[PDB]
Amino acid sequence: FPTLKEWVGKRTIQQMEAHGYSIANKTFEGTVGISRDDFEDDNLGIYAPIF
Amino acid sequence: MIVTPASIKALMTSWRKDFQGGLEDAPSQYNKIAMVVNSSTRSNTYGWLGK
């Protein structure tokens, strides 16, 4: 609101404002692929932690 | 006074074992910076997976 000021004649009508701001969201992706044979015959256990 | 030879006078000593361990070795402090792993065969192989 505008600051109060000394009153002399008649009231002077004043104005305010308003603001706006928008954020648009985005899509993100990551993909890896491994052969089925290589995954299945994995006795060591090195490809387990991919998930 | 009996004038004994030098070798006889040199044999008149007592053996003391207060000096037995010599000078002790430095403290062992390698566990603070090293990880101990036991091997069972010709060599060890380590493997990890990237991110």
Side-chain angles (χ1 to χ4, degrees):
Chain A
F1 207 67
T3 49
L4 267 51
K5 62 183 211 203
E6 181 104 58
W7 198 355
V8 181
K10 61 188 315 297
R11 302 216 185 193
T12 71
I13 302 178
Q14 291 187 58
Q15 296 177 357
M16 274 173 138
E17 58 170 359
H19 316 79
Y21 181 56
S22 64
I23 310 174
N25 39 56
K26 309 164 58 176
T27 310
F28 296 109
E29 163 262 349
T31 325
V32 189
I34 191 186
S35 175
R36 175 180 180 184
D37 309 356
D38 295 61
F39 207 67
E40 304 256 49
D41 48 52
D42 193 28
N43 45 352
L44 308 184
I46 48 184
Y47 305 136
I50 298 189
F51 207 104
Chain B
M1 171 205 58
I2 321 281
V3 285
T4 63
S7 61
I8 313 300
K9 274 192 299 293
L11 296 184
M12 282 155 148
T13 81
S14 43
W15 189 256
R16 284 302 188 271
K17 301 183 183 181
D18 323 313
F19 294 62
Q20 183 154 240
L23 290 123
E24 320 155 321
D25 302 296
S28 174
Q29 35 187 356
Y30 74 103
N31 290 294
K32 313 175 175 180
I33 72 177
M35 51 165 288
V36 187
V37 52
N38 288 269
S39 177
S40 171
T41 200
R42 195 182 303 234
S43 62
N44 286 1
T45 281
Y46 314 82
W48 57 105
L49 181 77
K51 297 172 179 300

